[PDB]
Ligand binder design. Structure first.
Ligand SMILES: NC(=O)C1=CN([C@@H]2O[C@H](COP(=O)(O)OP(=O)(O)OC[C@H]3O[C@@H](n4cnc5c(N)ncnc54)[C@H](OP(=O)(O)O)[C@@H]3O)[C@@H](O)[C@H]2O)C=CC1
Ligand SMILES: NC(=O)C1=CN([C@@H]2O[C@H](COP(=O)(O)OP(=O)(O)OC[C@H]3O[C@@H](n4cnc5c(N)ncnc54)[C@H](OP(=O)(O)O)[C@@H]3O)[C@@H](O)[C@H]2O)C=CC1
Ligand SMILES: NC(=O)C1=CN([C@@H]2O[C@H](COP(=O)(O)OP(=O)(O)OC[C@H]3O[C@@H](n4cnc5c(N)ncnc54)[C@H](OP(=O)(O)O)[C@@H]3O)[C@@H](O)[C@H]2O)C=CC1
Ligand SMILES: NC(=O)C1=CN([C@@H]2O[C@H](COP(=O)(O)OP(=O)(O)OC[C@H]3O[C@@H](n4cnc5c(N)ncnc54)[C@H](OP(=O)(O)O)[C@@H]3O)[C@@H](O)[C@H]2O)C=CC1
Lengths: 247, 247, 247, 247
């Protein structure tokens, strides 16, 4: 289709929104490389690769801890060597540590900032060197980057709003090559990080414009749109897929 | 066909961005009704309708001056009886009157607010009474709504930023019915109203992230995405298709 | 006395937030002219003039229905004849019509748009020609301009988000003369229009960062800061005085 | 003296914007503690302290590299013991590293994020434990957090937009104690880091609404406003003092 002949790199592709993104981009015809960290995700990841090869797509699963900048850079470099320069980079892997402000530890701080901020920045730096003209960079942000709404999300909210300025700076840095950079903001999305049946799920739905959690395909479709022909003129933008959480 | 069996209504569908939207939504399978104002556009408008019928879509062109609240309301009422309840309402017709602040007249003001603000609001009121659950409302705004950037556009920017609160409030009003309301913000788009080769065009390209005007298909593609299945959880959002004018 | 020798114009200065603005600006040394609409307010307004003159300030009370553009223009012109060119223009008078979207009437729309949008533009257009270099324009917006948050405020929200684009275009139109233009956004404020003890008031406090309504001096203080020496480099900004409603 | 009897903490208080803040908050009557990093600033820092003591204020200058979390925490703890619990915390010290995206180094990343993001978070965590009810947190951000405008500022813009989410979450975390948290975004301000006569200054003045750089008093005045009685209902806000750079 419209991604035929293109290479996509997706951090966190083993499950949740990232697995939905890799499936959607592969269906659009991209060759896919994606990362995972947890040892418990190794089986899921190699099964995911087998599912994509069975559809005739090239695919690689790469273990790379986003907490470690060297591991993210190596993953991209390995992806480039095996599939070629990356056309679509999707920074999706994330961590959510929430709680009373006085209990936040330095490990909470370094871990959140390395995974949610520095890793996307390192993947971009590694990928951009050889990204073909008209390339795409798509960061997964969060509705909490633009509105905290509640107590207990200060550190997470700061890591995710760091991507706003990073994305706008990237759209300026790379626009002369036709490369676009956008950040997508999910509202509540039914995944393991945020189950739709969690005890907190109900008070959250109460503040949405649409009275329900979204689904992982909602995010994958926004990403597929920014990745394809229809995204060519969208850049530097914050695109909320949040059910009207912000309205 | 992502829009098969749906009805779409589009103000200002005879040329420019509005024409590209009607072609795109019909090509996605929607029956289309759209408005035009000048008698000079009557030929172009009815040629457009036969072009869609020749592709097997039902389509109707209705002459309705956006300045007149009854004409817009009657235009929507006519489309509902001829094509059925509208699933996709696209408020696109607009006027751009620019110049020194001291030279602004009351006719400039009433004409700008009647066309850019009141006409969409009237069209939404007529369409919403019978819009099926899961429907879509899409206002065409402007990058000048979020950043004026220059002298001489105060009246126009006020009329477009008026769609921001209107859209967010509509998302809340209609969200229990699954209906979404979004505003898309064009950057410079090569049209009759904004030619890519106008004498001021170069200084506008100079402040962009991507160094060229966009094209009418770029706005149409965003509209088609919000109109379809992948837009189902986007609501109350402002979506820039501006080449990074805002980055 | 940072406003000594300056003239202020305040729509709606007879009560609520506008009465607090005229009091605060006069205490800073401004000669003041302000408008009222209700004949029932003539006693409060002329009482307000008497209180200011007893403090040695020049003051004028001018009846001007904001629904009528001509009355606003003539009020500004009279203030100018009486006190000299206005240094500080404060657009405060406003109307709040809320309710179900299907019950909005054209009278609701016309009255809301004339009072909340056209009247400020007309006052600015009257005052700007002879506004001294370094003057100030301050529009009173609302937190609902940036976030509707709930159903029933669509029309009001659109009227208020119209001031964002108008204010940013004015900051461009007039900045070469040193004139600033800003919009202030009250959060819930205890006044006649929004009593703190209304039966609906409690659910609103529940979404604030500070757990209470604000007070009219909170807006008056923000206005005084913009009017005076510390505001000289602030222009085109949206300033929330909303108790953290948007946070 | 609206800050009488209160204690203020200001990182980077020896010169530029931070010195003007320490002078303004002391002149409003606060006892002040502030940090510096360079051994070369030790004379300037202790001279500033003597200037404040000569006006009758208590003041302490503490060398503390913001890059080092323990030094930042230690400085806040030392000031709490010496001057008492902090009422007004001003995170001002910052670093600007600009250049091509591909040349950004690990040290550029680590130093920018440790200084612009982590140090403010650490100062806040230390001060908030004993901050008196009704206190104020004021982060110094940048107009580049909200709009990059140009190529070459990606890292810096990411570090500053991180303060947006941090500030909004802090406002929720602390609002129940009456504490406010806001970010001030300077435009170009004539200092050592951004001299008003630099070769790049003219093209920058060309994109402003006011056609000149601001001055350090313009920033000190907005902080003093936030710190005082008139800021009591402002929280979670982004307040631009940018000459209309964003208009
Ligand atoms: N879902 C939501 O409601 C919201 C989500 N977001 C953002 O969406 C993105 C993911 O959403 P979601 O799918 O819900 O998250 P999940 O926790 O459900 O899935 C997490 C994925 O990220 C990967 N990941 C986590 N930490 C690391 C790491 N240190 N190194 C490498 N990979 C890692 C996991 O890999 P493994 O399987 O190997 O652990 C897994 O594939 C995140 O950025 C999150 O912040 C934004 C707003 C709200
Ligand atoms: N193109 C750009 O660079 C930008 C565009 N926009 C917005 O995008 C939208 C369209 O832009 P563009 O395509 O350039 O506009 P064009 O002027 O090229 O096309 C205008 C269309 O609107 C119709 N129209 C105008 N006034 C009325 C009215 N009173 N009643 C009915 N129909 C009317 C015309 O019908 P007829 O053909 O009969 O005249 C025509 O079909 C507008 O909302 C515009 O403000 C915003 C920012 C930048
Ligand atoms: N109150 C709140 O919590 C919020 C307030 N706002 C905005 O703040 C502004 C004032 O709010 P508030 O003071 O609470 O409202 P009030 O009704 O309490 O005070 C209104 C003032 O405006 C004047 N006024 C009202 N309508 C007109 C008109 N058509 N023509 C001329 N003068 C008029 C009245 O004059 P008279 O005495 O002659 O009637 C009165 O002095 C408005 O623009 C409102 O939208 C924004 C968000 C929330
Ligand atoms: N000025 C501008 O044009 C703009 C400024 N800003 C922000 O405003 C704030 C101040 O601006 P400006 O006054 O121009 O900055 P300056 O560089 O002129 O002053 C720097 C101050 O920060 C201190 N400092 C720097 N690094 C450290 C550190 N690692 N540990 C402790 N103290 C440190 C310095 O201490 P010493 O004296 O020991 O060096 C000095 O007091 C910064 O956050 C900046 O990014 C935002 C937008 C535009």
């Amino acid at each position: 289709q419209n991604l035929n002949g293109k290479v996509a790199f997706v951090t966190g592709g083993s499950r949740g929104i990232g697995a939905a993104i890799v499936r959607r981009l592969a269906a659009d015809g991209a060759d896919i490389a994606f990362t995972y960290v947890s040892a418990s995700s190794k089986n899921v990841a190699t099964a995911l690769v087998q599912e994509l090869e069975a559809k005739g797509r090239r695919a690689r699963a790469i273990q790379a801890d986003s907490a470690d900048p060297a591991q993210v850079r190596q993953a991209v470099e390995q992806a480039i060597v095996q599939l070629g320069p990356v056309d679509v980079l999707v920074n999706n892997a994330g961590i959510f540590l929430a709680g009373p402000l006085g209990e936040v530890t330095l490990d909470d701080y370094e871990r959140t900032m390395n995974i949610n901020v520095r890793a996307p920045f390192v993947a971009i730096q590694a990928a951009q060197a050889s990204m073909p003209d008209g390339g795409r960079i798509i960061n997964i942000g969060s509705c909490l980057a633009e509105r905290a709404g509640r107590a207990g999300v200060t550190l997470y909210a700061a890591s995710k709003s760091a991507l706003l300025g990073m994305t706008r700076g990237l759209a300026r840095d790379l626009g002369a090559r036709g490369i676009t950079a956008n950040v997508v903001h999910p509202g509540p999305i039914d995944t393991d990080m945020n189950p739709a049946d969690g005890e907190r799920s109900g008070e959250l739905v109460a503040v949405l414009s649409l009275p329900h959690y979204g689904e992982v395909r909602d995010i994958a479709g926004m990403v597929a749109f920014l990745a394809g022909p229809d995204g060519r003129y969208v850049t530097g933008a914050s695109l909320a897929v949040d059910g009207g959480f912000a309205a």
